[PDB]
Amino acid sequence: PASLLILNGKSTDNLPLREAIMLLREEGMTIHVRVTWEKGDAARYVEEARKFGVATVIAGGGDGTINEVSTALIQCEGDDIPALGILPLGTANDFATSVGIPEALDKALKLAIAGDAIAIDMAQVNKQTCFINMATGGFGTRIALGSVSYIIHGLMRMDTLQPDRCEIRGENFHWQGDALVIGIGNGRQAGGGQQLCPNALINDGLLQLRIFTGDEILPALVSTLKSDEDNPNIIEGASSWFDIQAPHDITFNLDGEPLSGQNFHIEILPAALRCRLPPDCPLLRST
Ligand SMILES: [Mg+2]
């Protein structure tokens, strides 16, 4: 079936992508390519996708583009809403990796056009911003050892990071104390390979919570985020909602977009969006 590929500003000179798209066009497939320039554009092209009667709107880009498209799709009122497909055309591609999208773009394209579509959750913060992958929160200022800088810059989108007090409540969950990193996940992975929520499933109606207590980012935290480390200094929960509050501003990075304040209500939007996913998809619950 026909698709509309929503491409980023950083994709218009990807020759392999062009080659792949072009090779699939000359196989009988209808594939519209639209390029975004500013926010609001994905929305505009999502609705043009509708007018065409298209079956998949394909986010070609980073976790940001996927979130722009996803957010636009869930806002659609009506009957014939396109499934979400995903091309891994970002720098980090955390969500795409974690849901098993193939690196081979012809394959990823084909998945995105002809895969099975399944309803997945999204999440919303403060009845406003939505996210499909991960919300990471910490206390710091907005943006020697590279392991550590990578976390503060890439994962947290900050220049500084310090622990501070907060309280967090959710179903079966109540905690107060100093936290260095808060991970609230629909997906499992953020900031280029950091495993914030190893146990996340994207269609269980449930957000994973992990609170990393600390002092600073130590080999502890770098270790525990890369591969798997089983660690007592990590507090875990699972809830359809989490409330977070703090005497000083916490900064949440929601699929790459910052938000600050003393109070956050984060809540699952159950089965909000159909996404084209491989059958083995590690983040879908067993059936
Ligand atoms: Mg879940």
From Swiss-Prot:
Cellular component terms (Gene Ontology): cytoplasm
Biological processes, Gene Ontology terms: phospholipid biosynthetic process
Pfam entry (one): YegS_C
Record: active site: E257 (proton acceptor)
Cited function: In vitro phosphorylates phosphatidylglycerol but not diacylglycerol; the in vivo substrate is unknown.
Chief localization: cytoplasm
Cofactor requirement: Mg(2+); Ca(2+)
Species this chain originates from: Escherichia coli (strain K12)
Domain named DAGKc: residues: 1-129
SUPFAM superfamilies recorded: NAD kinase/diacylglycerol kinase-like (SSF111331)
EC number of the protein: 2.7.1.-
Oligomeric form and interacting partners: Monomer.
Family: Belongs to the diacylglycerol/lipid kinase family. YegS lipid kinase subfamily.
Domain of life, per lineage: Bacteria
Protein name according to UniProt: Lipid kinase YegS
pH dependence: Optimum pH is 7.5. Active from pH 5 to 9.
Cofactor stoichiometry and binding remark: Binds 1 Mg(2+) ion per subunit. Ca(2+) may be able to substitute.
Top-level EC class: transferase
MF terms (GO), sorted A to Z: ATP binding; lipid kinase activity; magnesium ion binding
Binding positions for Mg(2+) per the UniProt entry: L201, D204, L206
Chain residues that bind ATP: T36, G62, D63, G64, T65, I66, N67, E68, T91
Keywords: ATP-binding, Cytoplasm, Kinase, Lipid biosynthesis, Lipid metabolism, Magnesium, Metal-binding, Nucleotide-binding, Phospholipid biosynthesis, Phospholipid metabolism, Transferase
Xref: InterPro entries: ATP-NAD_kinase_N, Diacylglycerol/lipid_kinase, Diacylglycerol_kinase_cat_dom, Lip_kinase_YegS, Lipid_Phosphate_FormReg, NAD/diacylglycerol_kinase_sf, YegS/DAGK_C
Gene3D superfamilies, sorted: 2.60.200.40, Probable inorganic polyphosphate/atp-NAD kinase, domain 1 (3.40.50.10330)
Subcellular location, record wording: Cytoplasm
